[model samples]
Target: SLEKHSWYHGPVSRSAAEYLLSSLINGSFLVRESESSPGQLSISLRYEGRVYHYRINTTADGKVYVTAESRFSTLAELVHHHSTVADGLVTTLHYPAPKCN
Candidate 1:
């Protein structure tokens, strides 16, 4: 699944990405950025014990886009047909990385 394999690489606050991943995994994961200068992000999926690092970015439209390449047209289709889901995926994974708030 795109959510499983792909790394988080987009223009958004690290905190946002953390929130989204947390929500998606139901708080089974914790994501944090480095405290040092040029703070990079580290995400750990507690249940699976999977960890990832990412560089975040944001678009001019106030949308955070992931830098993943997918052969599956499903993502494109989701963006095309079910835009809400696509946007949700983006926003959920980018800005305000969703947690119970």
Candidate 2:
């Protein structure tokens, strides 16, 4: 019974990660598709200056989910963790409008 599905690595699609990033992260960002693993995506939060990796997968019902490899639940949380615990510093995504004269 163990051999039946043991070889299945997991879902590794691009759609899932794209959807999550589009919905949650709204700022300058960069995406790099891994040549080694076609389904892996590394998203860089430019303002945050941190890169988080995730494997994307889609369900039969067309649902999308992500498995993080960067030990982050979310970029915001990750930034805080680094700043507070890791003693790291990064800038948040912000755009200030010029004062209306």
Candidate 3:
């Protein structure tokens, strides 16, 4: 299932957070949660015959944070990152975007 694309009206049902999941569905881009921390999430996806893992986390403030081996969140702050990376570097949330900050 994919989220709505490019629609901003009184808070669209889908957000960049939703975009993360929708965009990673090829063969198997598995997403799971961690019991160790309620703010932790894990993703497993295979590309070019290799499996990769990523982590996403949410802060007390509520925003999306990611890493090569990290976590991300739903939506928060002005973290309006552009999803123009188009690269599965598997580091920058598998997406690279031009940051204005």
Candidate 4:
């Protein structure tokens, strides 16, 4: 239900997200506004010493998902799911990169 949390970096560029995740260990991640798709969301994750980006698609009814087969009602829900299960990701999310004040 909590969509606008500190882990959600709004309007951040892909490079900026990589710069932020670079310091964290594998499985660290963050959500940001998608650069290529307006009004869409992208999740930036750290895995194997590299940063990976994945787009979150939403259904017409407001369900959000990285993999369509497993959809959630909100962005937070989607993140929570990925935390426990890697699913289609490189790894399960471990830490959420803190936002710089």
Estimate the TM-score of every prediction: 0.28, 0.28, 0.37, 0.87
How far in Å is the alpha carbon of 9 misplaced in model 3?
28
Order of the predicted models by lDDT, top scorer first: 4, 1, 3, 2
Per-candidate Cα lDDT values, in order, are: 0.35, 0.34, 0.35, 0.85
Which one is best on TM-score? Answer: 4
TM-score of decoy 1: 0.28
Shift of residue 87 alpha carbon in model 4, Å: 1.1
lDDT of 2 by residue, 1-101 (tens): 21122212233234433333343433333333454564564433333333344333445554333422224534334433433332221333222111111
Residues 1-101 of candidate 1: C-alpha lDDT, one tens digit per residue = 33322332333344554445543542233334444533454443322322243333444544433343322233333233322333322222322233332
Q: Model 4: runs farther than 4 Å from truth?
A: 1-4, 35-38
Q: What digit string (tens of lDDT, one per residue) describes model 4 on residues 1-101?
A: 23467668777789989999998999889888865655877899999999999988989998999987889998888888999999888999779898864
In lDDT terms, how accurate is model 3? 0.35
Clash pairs detected, candidate 4: none
Top lDDT: which candidate number?
4
Q: What CA RMSD would you report for each candidate? A: 10.8, 14.6, 10.8, 2.1
List, residue by residue over 1-101, the lDDT tens digit for candidate 3: 11121211112122333344344433334343443443455444444544454454556765545532322455221112313231333422232211111
